[PDB]
Design a protein around this ligand. Structure first.
Ligand SMILES: Nc1ncnc2c1ncn2[C@@H]1O[C@H](COP(=O)(O)OP(=O)(O)OP(=O)(O)OP(=O)(O)OP(=O)(O)OC[C@H]2O[C@@H](n3cnc4c(N)ncnc43)[C@H](O)[C@@H]2O)[C@@H](O)[C@H]1O
Length: 214
């Protein structure tokens, strides 16, 4: 099973990724998680993203494409994977097709622009695992702590109001066109496309995705 999650920043993609991963027993390929990890570890492949992410801009297609190629070549992706934040531009989507990476489902998470800053100001993360929380809308079971490891949650450095605004501009400029791109792929019978209302509570979005996936 191969799935792409599409949506504006803060739409809920990473939150629902956890539930899809357990359903199909497939790993999550999160380019945001991988770029942040490369910066933290100083890995030659990806540390370049530090200044770009801080400015709210997109990392070069060339750099992310190489990160994903390396990741999906490993044994745990042999029987499927979940793409979460990739592709983010048309050239990234074209690179997947040129490389013969078809997918079974493309799932669009729709959230109005006006809700996005509130979602990100309350976002707290557990960087080692990628788990995501929200202090109001989806809080940890213990305040400030990861549910699984008990480690103190952090706030992403790019989760500031002004940076999220810039991310939203970049999304509409370069990423939103992927909705039409993959809608046409579905019209041609190359994948399945579905849109969900991301303003519903987390558990209701999860149930809506269950009905689409079966
Ligand atoms: N492919 C690529 N090409 C180029 N550059 C790339 C790239 N990939 C990454 N980058 C770089 O990395 C930077 C950051 O990218 P990225 O890591 O993708 O961050 P982002 O743009 O801010 O959006 P996310 O995908 O992290 O949010 P989400 O849709 O998963 O929602 P979430 O579950 O967290 O939920 C949001 C919040 O709301 C809460 N919430 C979730 N669901 C609900 C709900 N249903 N109701 C209420 N609250 C909810 C959550 O708890 C959370 O707190 C980019 O600017 C770029 O520089």
């Amino acid at each position: 099973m191969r799935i792409i999650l599409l949506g504006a920043p803060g739409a809920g993609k990473g939150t629902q990724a956890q539930f899809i991963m357990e359903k199909y027993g497939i790993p999550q390929i999160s380019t945001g998680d991988m770029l942040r990890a490369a910066v933290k570890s100083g890995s030659e492949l990806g540390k370049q993203a530090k200044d770009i992410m801080d400015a709210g801009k997109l990392v070069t297609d060339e750099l992310v494409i190489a990160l994903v190629k390396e990741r999906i070549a490993q044994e745990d992706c042999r029987n499927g994977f979940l793409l979460d934040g990739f592709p983010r531009t048309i050239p990234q989507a074209d690179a997947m097709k040129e490389a013969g990476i078809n997918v079974d489902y493309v799932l669009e998470f729709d959230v109005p622009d006006a809700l996005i800053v509130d979602r990100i100001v309350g976002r707290r993360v557990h960087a080692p695992s990628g788990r995501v929380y929200h202090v109001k809308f989806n809080p940890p079971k213990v305040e400030g702590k990861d549910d699984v490891t008990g480690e103190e949650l952090t706030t992403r450095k790019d989760d500031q109001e002004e940076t999220v605004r810039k991310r939203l501009v970049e999304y509409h400029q370069m990423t939103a066109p992927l909705i039409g791109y993959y809608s046409k792929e579905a019209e041609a019978g190359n994948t399945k496309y579905a849109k969900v209302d991301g303003t519903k509570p987390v558990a209701e979005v999860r149930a809506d995705l269950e009905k689409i996936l079966g």
